[PDB]
Ligand binder design. Structure first.
Ligand SMILES: *C(=O)[C@@H](NC(=O)/C(=N\OC)c1csc(N)n1)[C@@H]1N=C(C(=O)O)C(=C)CS1
Length: 238
């Protein structure tokens, strides 16, 4: 069941910011859509840095890296030695590009097709297909992927999935944990912003989300997290 959720308030959150966006929520066997541009939920976009979740899974599963490896730029914040988990937190593109080159094109295409992530097209450049195309994915497809990660239902080892989940913890309070990954594809004709993840409630219940919106260069990166938290509170998910 995919349905519009009844929410006047979340539509207004997107409107106030003069942006077009959608929030996709998956619980149990229900997907609900919120926001002011619900047609975005079935629209294909580059995954941008959200692909780091799948890149990490493939690399760990195939023993191209491990969680303790120290990998020795656009942002000064990237200009340092770091682990795969620290690269996840910082969205350090060059670390993920190095991992992708280790995986190589043959393995990468085989794995993305096996998973069926989005359109599953990687083309011929192994180091940037998730940033500039041809790989594209819908917000509904992203919520389904991350819900499977959260439930350890992807077709990877249980330990590898647990290790990637542990890299994704964003916030917690009152026993609720929020896991996820941001992405932003800048310097294109319509900028796309992502925040895809899940809430783990105190009893262990999982509520998955994918926020997908049009970005502007004037916005702070944190607008994605702010809109997500306001929306999740409004829905009583946190
Ligand atoms: C991931 O989305 C990644 N974004 C980029 O590398 C891009 N631009 O940043 C300069 C990009 C991807 S496709 C395109 N045309 N441009 C990182 N994303 C975040 C984030 O929080 O979303 C960052 C911390 C900066 S770079």
């Amino acid at each position: 069941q995919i349905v519009q959720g009844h929410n006047q308030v979340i539509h207004q959150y997107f409107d106030e910011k003069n942006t077009s966006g959608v929030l996709v929520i998956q619980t149990d066997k229900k997907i609900n859509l919120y926001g002011n541009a619900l047609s975005r939920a079935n629209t294909e976009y580059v995954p941008a840095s959200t692909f780091d979740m799948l890149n990490a899974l493939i690399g760990l599963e195939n023993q191209k890296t491990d969680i303790n490896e120290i990998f020795k730029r656009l942002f000064t914040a990237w200009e340092k030695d770091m682990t795969l988990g620290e690269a996840m937190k910082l969205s350090a593109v060059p670390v993920y590009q190095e991992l992708a080159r280790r995986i190589g094109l043959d393995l990468m295409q085989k794995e993305v097709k096996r998973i069926g992530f989005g359109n599953a097209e990687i083309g011929q450049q192994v180091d940037n297909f998730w940033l500039v195309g041809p790989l594209k994915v819908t917000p509904i497809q992203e919520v389904e992927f991350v819900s499977q990660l959260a439930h350890t239902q992807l077709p990877f080892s249980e330990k590898v999935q647990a290790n990637v989940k542990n890299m994704l913890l964003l916030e917690e309070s009152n026993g609720y944990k929020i896991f996820g990954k941001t992405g932003w594809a800048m310097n294109i004709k319509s900028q796309v912003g992502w925040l895809t993840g899940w809430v783990e409630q105190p009893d262990g219940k999982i509520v998955a989300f994918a926020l997908n919106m049009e970005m502007r260069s004037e916005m702070p990166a944190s607008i994605r997290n702010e809109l997500l938290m306001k929306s999740l509170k409004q829905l009583n998910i946190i």
